[PDB]
Design a protein around this ligand. Sequence first.
Ligand SMILES: NS(=O)(=O)c1cc2c(cc1Cl)N[C@H]([C@H]1C[C@H]3C=C[C@@H]1C3)NS2(=O)=O
Ligand SMILES: NS(=O)(=O)c1cc2c(cc1Cl)N[C@H]([C@H]1C[C@H]3C=C[C@@H]1C3)NS2(=O)=O
Ligand SMILES: NS(=O)(=O)c1cc2c(cc1Cl)N[C@H]([C@H]1C[C@H]3C=C[C@@H]1C3)NS2(=O)=O
Ligand SMILES: NS(=O)(=O)c1cc2c(cc1Cl)N[C@H]([C@H]1C[C@H]3C=C[C@@H]1C3)NS2(=O)=O
Ligand SMILES: N[C@@H](CCC(=O)O)C(=O)O
Ligand SMILES: N[C@@H](CCC(=O)O)C(=O)O
Ligand SMILES: N[C@@H](CCC(=O)O)C(=O)O
Ligand SMILES: N[C@@H](CCC(=O)O)C(=O)O
Lengths: 270, 260, 260, 270
Amino acid sequence: KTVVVTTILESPYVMMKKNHEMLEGNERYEGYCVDLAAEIAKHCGFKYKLTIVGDGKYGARDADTKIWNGMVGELVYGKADIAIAPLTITLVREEVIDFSKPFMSLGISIMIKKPQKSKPLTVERMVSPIESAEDLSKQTEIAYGTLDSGSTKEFFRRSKIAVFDKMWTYMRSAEPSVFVRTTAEGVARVRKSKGKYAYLLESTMNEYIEQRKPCDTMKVGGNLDSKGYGIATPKGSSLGTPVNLAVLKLSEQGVLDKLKNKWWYDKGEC
Amino acid sequence: KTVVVTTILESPYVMMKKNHEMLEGNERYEGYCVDLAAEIAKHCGFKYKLTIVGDGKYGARDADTKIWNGMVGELVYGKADIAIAPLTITLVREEVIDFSKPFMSLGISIMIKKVSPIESAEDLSKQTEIAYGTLDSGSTKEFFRRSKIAVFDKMWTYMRSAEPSVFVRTTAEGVARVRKSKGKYAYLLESTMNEYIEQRKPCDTMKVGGNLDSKGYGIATPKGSSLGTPVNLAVLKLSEQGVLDKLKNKWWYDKGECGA
Amino acid sequence: KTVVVTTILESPYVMMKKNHEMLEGNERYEGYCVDLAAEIAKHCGFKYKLTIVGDGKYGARDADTKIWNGMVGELVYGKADIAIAPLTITLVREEVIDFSKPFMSLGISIMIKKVSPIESAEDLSKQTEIAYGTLDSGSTKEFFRRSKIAVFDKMWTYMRSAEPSVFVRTTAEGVARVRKSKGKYAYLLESTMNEYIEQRKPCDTMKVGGNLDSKGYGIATPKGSSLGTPVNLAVLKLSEQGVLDKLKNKWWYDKGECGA
Amino acid sequence: KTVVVTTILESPYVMMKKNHEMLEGNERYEGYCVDLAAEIAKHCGFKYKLTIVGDGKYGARDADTKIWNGMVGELVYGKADIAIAPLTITLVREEVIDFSKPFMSLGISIMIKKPQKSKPLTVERMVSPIESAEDLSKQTEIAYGTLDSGSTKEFFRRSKIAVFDKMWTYMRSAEPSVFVRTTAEGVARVRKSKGKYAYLLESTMNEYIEQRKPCDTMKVGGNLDSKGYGIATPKGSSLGTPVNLAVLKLSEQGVLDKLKNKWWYDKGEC
Ligand SMILES: NS(=O)(=O)c1cc2c(cc1Cl)N[C@H]([C@H]1C[C@H]3C=C[C@@H]1C3)NS2(=O)=O
Ligand SMILES: NS(=O)(=O)c1cc2c(cc1Cl)N[C@H]([C@H]1C[C@H]3C=C[C@@H]1C3)NS2(=O)=O
Ligand SMILES: NS(=O)(=O)c1cc2c(cc1Cl)N[C@H]([C@H]1C[C@H]3C=C[C@@H]1C3)NS2(=O)=O
Ligand SMILES: NS(=O)(=O)c1cc2c(cc1Cl)N[C@H]([C@H]1C[C@H]3C=C[C@@H]1C3)NS2(=O)=O
Ligand SMILES: N[C@@H](CCC(=O)O)C(=O)O
Ligand SMILES: N[C@@H](CCC(=O)O)C(=O)O
Ligand SMILES: N[C@@H](CCC(=O)O)C(=O)O
Ligand SMILES: N[C@@H](CCC(=O)O)C(=O)O
């Protein structure tokens, strides 16, 4: 029996190959997550089929409707067996699905358009109007937002820290809406907003986008928190312990480090 | 029913208080792990008693004996109910005990005395002038022993065949040996311990290069115990509430007895 | 019995003089390989005739047909008696023809137009901005095809799946493509050819990095022929007498039509 | 049946391990040649034993008696089957034994004691009294010699080049004898002669000795010629073709390059 591996289209985790029109099956996709699935299969023998989540969402719970959407919803309602995707381990998600040990460490970072070089002996220096989350919250000329139906938005919603609470209070009543539907949409907003929009995304995606052309964006400050990506399985499933053991084996063998190096830094430019 | 909490004396995780002679119970202990244990107990809602492991070892399996020692042995053999200590999450340990989600990130680092010719670990393995060792009965030693990476294979080949014994009994003794080696001995240890040592007086040791790999400390529970899910949710809630970051800042950088 | 010698038009190995239209026989050819063939004939004591291979290919076997072309094909199928030419000694060729001892050392080198950002082979593979190719039906292409090293595997994967065809038909064609690419294309060729090109006008190309590997040119002879031992002894005698070094200096640095 | 592999005690080709007193068999020795023999065995399956030539000589054709000695001699007379050792491919040797493709390139170089750095804005410069071979031949205040019963001595003996002929003419009638019995003896002579002795050895050994402590010797100029080391085998033997094919396989596979890098440059003490 073949199990369903749900995932989301997000570079560099899951990207379509250039010649993907003539290919079929799992060979159309490429990235970190497809290699992770291949290594998981190598550890524990099973047949898997790569599928993309229908709504293109990571997962969230509506307050009034109380139905999980995205990959978490797909896993909860039995439409998938395992989610090998950049899914953030959160307390609310852990109560409805099973998470393995983290395979990648990350944190919430800020993305802004890279400032032009300041000419004024004849040294060149780069100065950005945002240096930390606190000054980003204090100012009001640059709008900021997160990804809709994501872990960062829920983190800001349920944060009792004064700075993060202030940012959330600004976000919930910002006209026009500062929330985006996709990471690429947020990066496009940052690029075309001429320095008047800051995107709050994970540090891994931020660094990856900064490492590729045209590299007109930069990451400012440090990470707002420390989290991780976990492989998710439904509650009471027989694939949880083998997946956790496989992740631990890959971590000890150094496969994860080599995968990160070959998918993030060996493919950068500029 | 009071829950026995095994732990090890390792700064800044667990320390003996200055007036611990005139104190009883858990009130004679201080550190990151003490506050973490207090918050875990508050979240779960149980009474706990802090106990120090009889042998100052984290845990390992002896060859041709298959007997666990340290806090891992204290857990597999029913002598303890939970282990709130800087216990590295490893593949070998996870097959006998239940680990929660990591609460602190870390990695293997190199500590030398205060140009830094050694720099990275590859250059350290490329030079026989400087000796390097690890802590015995620890995750770093097992990581080096089982490593299939070529560089780490050469490092393990050196350590296993070296006279005198390049391994050390305790982390404090290892950093002392580094201090008194006049730049001839290098210590391999956890990144958090290295940072804590290098931020303290006399600040005669420094950390060179990045982390060799990345692991985490987890709260360990006996396999099949009923405390695994509650402590896992407690760790997740503490991480999302910013408590773990504030505790690390309090016990690593708030004091800062050095100029940096 | 006149011995048919097959060779390829490559500089400075074989050239068609300047007034070849008014010359017949071997007198219309010049170069390192012509002098080497003259020395080999003088040592062994046989009359020889220089012929140019019909197709300007060094030699390879095509998949699903198992037919050799070029000088290797000229030797395996009995069309030639000996091959004095810059023929790289390779494992696949050695199983079908007899190679003598190498008479010239060489290696695979990278060249671009006139500090180079490309630097070594690893950085060249990493930077997708610059395209790199290889001569068709040569030993470099087969070296990259059969290579199991990861970096060379990436290079070969790029070359096979490249649009337009990153390969070239002749060495001069690749030289011209590098010259007219304005620093966008890099050529992968032999070290000796690279040095000869870079030491000639207009001196717009330079060799970067070191040598990817180390190989040698050998005098090829049909398998199980009576000429193998005499030509091997002749090559050894020429090497010990310093004739090969003298010829290389004459044809590589004596002229030197460049600013260096 | 197990064949006999004859070797020479030369570093870093064949070296004894520190704990070689309690070891037996092929595990006693270490170096480049033992790994070469192991790879040859892996390519073509056979059982081999490592022996050291009795007289400790590479091989030379003794005049008058016309009897070969050393590794070449013991290969000719049947007491050895294959010589995996730094044996130079020469015309005289090729006529009595078989030689494979060269597995390592080399040349004749000059070894002199490293001079002290010159005191003279405040830059420090290194100046040596010998820069090439012809100036070494011209002067007479510095003695120089080669290895007895070696390939370099034979090369100088039959060389018709004017400068090499002049060096040979000086060498044959030099008292006390400038020739040494072992490479280590010549290096000791260079070190203890306080700049009044130059040792002519192969470039590989010269570089290896340069890279190790106390590194008080240096190589001046360039190689006098271009040669190579071959895997010798008796004339009309069945092991010549498999040995040649294995050498080609190792060269194309990159094994030889990594072996040479690990033995010569990885263990650099200076
Ligand atoms: N450098 S990285 O982000 O690619 C990365 C991050 C991590 C890795 C491995 C790598 Cl390569 N393994 C750890 C795992 C190992 C054991 C301890 C924590 C989990 C279980 N999680 S992690 O700390 O999130
Ligand atoms: N900054 S730190 O080292 O004290 C640190 C490190 C980590 C924290 C929290 C903190 Cl404060 N939480 C994560 C946990 C949270 C959820 C996602 C990964 C695990 C489960 N583990 S971690 O990445 O090892
Ligand atoms: N200096 S050079 O490249 O023209 C050159 C290169 C080489 C020469 C001679 C010269 Cl002049 N001879 C050797 C041969 C001689 C004997 C030892 C190795 C082979 C057999 N091959 S080589 O190392 O490929
Ligand atoms: N760089 S090195 O001296 O260790 C070295 C030197 C040589 C190598 C391989 C290496 Cl790694 N292979 C060549 C061989 C390969 C094929 C072409 C010439 C011989 C047959 N001989 S070589 O040119 O003498
Ligand atoms: N990785 C997040 C989504 C990305 C983001 O919110 O920035 C998740 O799994 O929910
Ligand atoms: N904290 C580690 C020990 C430190 C070390 O490996 O030196 C463990 O629990 O195994
Ligand atoms: N001279 C080489 C061809 C050069 C190349 O590989 O580009 C040969 O004989 O195969
Ligand atoms: N390699 C040489 C010996 C060393 C030398 O003469 O310098 C030989 O095989 O004879």
